[PDB]
Design a binder for these strands. Sequence first.
RNA 1: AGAUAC
Length: 762
Amino acid sequence: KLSFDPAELLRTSLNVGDIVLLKQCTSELTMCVNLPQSTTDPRYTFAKKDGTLVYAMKNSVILRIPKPVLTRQLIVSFTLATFTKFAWTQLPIVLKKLELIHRYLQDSRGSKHVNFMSLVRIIKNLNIKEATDAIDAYVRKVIDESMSNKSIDPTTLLATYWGVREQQQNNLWGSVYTNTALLSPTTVAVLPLKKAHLFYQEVITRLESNDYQEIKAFAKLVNDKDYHSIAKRYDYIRTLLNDYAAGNIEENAVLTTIISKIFRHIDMYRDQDVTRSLCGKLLVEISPQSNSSNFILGNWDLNIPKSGISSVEQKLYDTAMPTIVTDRYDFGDMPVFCIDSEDAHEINDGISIEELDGVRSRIHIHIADPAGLFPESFDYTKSGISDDVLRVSLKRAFTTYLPDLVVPMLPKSFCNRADLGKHDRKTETISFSFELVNKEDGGLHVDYDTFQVRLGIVSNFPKVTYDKVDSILNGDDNSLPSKQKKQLELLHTLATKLLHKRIHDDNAVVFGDGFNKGLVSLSPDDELCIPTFYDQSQTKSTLLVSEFMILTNKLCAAFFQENKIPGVYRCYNGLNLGNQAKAQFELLKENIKLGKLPSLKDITKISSQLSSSFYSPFPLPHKMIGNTAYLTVTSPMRRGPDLINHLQLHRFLKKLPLCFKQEYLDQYVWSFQARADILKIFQRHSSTYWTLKHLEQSGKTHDVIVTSVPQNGTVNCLFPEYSYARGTLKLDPAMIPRIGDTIRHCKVESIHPLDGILTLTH
RNA sequence: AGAUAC
Ligand SMILES: [Mg+2]
């Protein structure tokens, strides 16, 4: 065991024996020595080289290496020491490689990510002496050769991480993202030498010369409120403030000091902690009157198009057209229900039912077929991907949905063509058909032998929204044909039994009330700048739609496995938990069978025992949805995993050579999981920004629920009324509260929206 | 933190 397989990360959860890097101890190795014991305290116990323990949140783990009292302490310590030693020895050599291959990976035009693993492999497999010979070809040989085994050397891994954190300080690499489920790094940006490293070197130089004269000249202009000259003269400083508020340079400490000096020289801002919000306030103050300014949108990793690389790609997307334009089953005038919101972009799904008997119904799930618009759907002559629009699409591994804006994974042209829901238009689908039988027990049974996958056509699309459907199933609405209206009631009654089945039979875990309140929508102004809040609805139509997609996705799992097809699955492992905690958890899991579903107060206590879901190149149980594999196909225009599962289908159904061998898959799943993580983050970050910006506009008291153990006399908390208003409370020393506890009257200390900071007193 | 849709 000198190397390990990245796959054991997916197969395993955090467990004792794991060797970790913590956010606390980024420069010392640690090792998990105990798991959480209760809901009262859900932290893991880690041991340092010194035998000193550390208790930390599962998510404080930045990277993970999978697996007589004194002997145990001794072997724990000597192990950690050995790994550190061999790690340190490589490090001066690794820094040299990092600077070097940074020359080959960099793109001159903007930030560009790379799989962190692929990167580690290059570090290991590279000879500096051969790379410097006047016969480059070598380096490119090592990079392509990174694809093979796929095993990874832990010490090189550790050293590379350390090397990157070091060269991060020179604006050579972006942040290292650590996936929540695997607890391991996924990707890191490679920032351009001239546009970021070098630019900020010249900035620092020009600002410190003649004892910070230009800092001084600038701060004067600000105090004299002459914003005009700032524009002509000091735009490089606006840039700097911008890169701080957006979160691009928040890790370069020189620049933070520079910024401290500037605030120190400005009257209003002089005494205040240097926070992105504060850079935002200033930058707003010295820039022409806007209506809103979400600066998170400037973030390089969020990677919205602004000049750059993505600005190049959208120049293609704007003029791209799916001229790839044949043996499909036609469903005729059979009606297809596309139950989406009024404010929807991509219509990926439709439902059709045929009532055959009182006992039996046949179901058709018509998924848009974006895979069809590309030569790769059918072309067995060329292995891999030749197409521009397709490579780009897979790079934007999902559509980016934010309260501010949306960035579709696919071009507008391809979306109009592939979209469902266009009435009386012959519309290509991929359709999954099967039959359900009502069972004697009142239950329901699914005939997998009915299950069928076909390339179809549909054209009869009833106009429907989750609301219209709901008012229909209440009787409020009767604008629909009685034949159509009854297919809905039938579908709704089928889902109810599907859901009841998933709970009692698949031991699925399904959430109750309160879980998605105060979500964020922008409203426009006298410009989308007004936040309005809502709850995600759990209704008859959502229940209907959801139950079927879940089922569709479960079945393609079965299909891909039985036919030995490489697919992108979505998995969920859960946590390794202490025996007393596993009972606190299990006690809640029987409550869902019995009829009570968990409250968010109840979930807060449980939330300290949950994992997150992750994509995988091979089947693993998604242990929430049920006890079985799960492969997402229902949203091929907005999820890359689904989109890839479709190209495999096109190949298979036309009995062609498949598009992807299993090896090409692991590379993409890494690419996808990376982009998935970034998006979860920036979704939370922006909505938080807006939750807080509203709490600012609204003006001192609110009720909260405790969500953490006191660390330095302070707890984490959340607002029941708002999902993205998470803060910290300074506990009153006069008295300690448990997790899930409510505190009704609380004083607001500070609010920093661009930073996500919310502070309170009791 | 799970799920669906977007
Ligand atoms: Mg829909």
